[PDB]
Amino acid sequence: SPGIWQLDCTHLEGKVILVAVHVASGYIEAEVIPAETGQETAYFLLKLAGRWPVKTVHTDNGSNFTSTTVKAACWWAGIKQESMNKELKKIIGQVRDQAEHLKTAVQMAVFIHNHKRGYSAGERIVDIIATD
Amino acid sequence: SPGIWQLDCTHLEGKVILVAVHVASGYIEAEVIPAETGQETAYFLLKLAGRWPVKTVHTDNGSNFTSTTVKAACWWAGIKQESMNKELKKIIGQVRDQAEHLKTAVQMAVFIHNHKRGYSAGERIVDIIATD
């Protein structure tokens, strides 16, 4: 289904990477957040929902979504409740030297992942959303 | 052309909002940045390029792109060099009370703008990129 996203946090260099995967296409949005808090998840959800038709959200840690602030963001954006962290960490390690900050390398790995091809993840998400 | 984005900063509450507009569709990405620096523009460009096919970038302030760090981000993402800030500020003011932080209100205004309809800005950008 075109509106299903999976959201999770992973850890690297003592920092937290919030990874959102459009399940139907494998397309990734990811950001380095200062702490693994409900406020950061709520804000990230608001950002994501403004850029993509986010209908339902899955996670591998259901307690991520128990926050009063997270439920309000979902409420406001009309969101209901519905590996890749290894692939993203692999690309991060490949490009890790190309940048000082981990957050820069994360965006590089997101770029590479979404455009790597026989279409790419970025190519088939816009097709999925367009046809639907 | 589907790869043309316009990037600018605007000011509100002593803070800086970086606004990127997909010119062909009117679709907006916007973030609150701590300062109007080349590093923040470079990082924002890296984020944008990983999510959309960014080919060329325009701006209303050409000195935004003179930074050595900005030119490197463009170089790495394959980017070449090619109102709405009033409409975004208007929506921000409408939803300004719904949130404490300006950055939250910005994302709300982005959400509203991209999904307001007779298609919406978010709808026609994915169509433009899909057909192309």
Ligand SMILES: Cc1nc2c(c(C)c(C)n2Cc2cnn(C)c2)c(-c2ccc(Cl)cc2)c1[C@H](OC(C)(C)C)C(=O)O
């Ligand atoms: C912190 C930083 N400083 C930078 C650059 C660059 C290219 C230069 C010249 N400088 C100044 C410098 C470096 N060494 N010296 C002695 C001076 C980059 C960078 C790295 C890769 C890309 Cl594609 C684009 C920019 C970054 C990146 O941070 C962002 C937030 C992305 C700006 C990062 O995380 O590496």
Ligand SMILES: Cc1nc2c(c(C)c(C)n2Cc2cnn(C)c2)c(-c2ccc(Cl)cc2)c1[C@H](OC(C)(C)C)C(=O)O
């Ligand atoms: C800072 C903040 N705290 C919040 C919320 C909510 C809903 C609650 C309950 N709290 C705790 C609270 C508030 N008052 N009291 C006494 C305790 C929100 C919020 C506002 C709008 C949406 Cl859709 C979603 C969340 C935010 C937003 O920040 C982000 C970064 C988005 C979390 C913001 O900028 O308002």
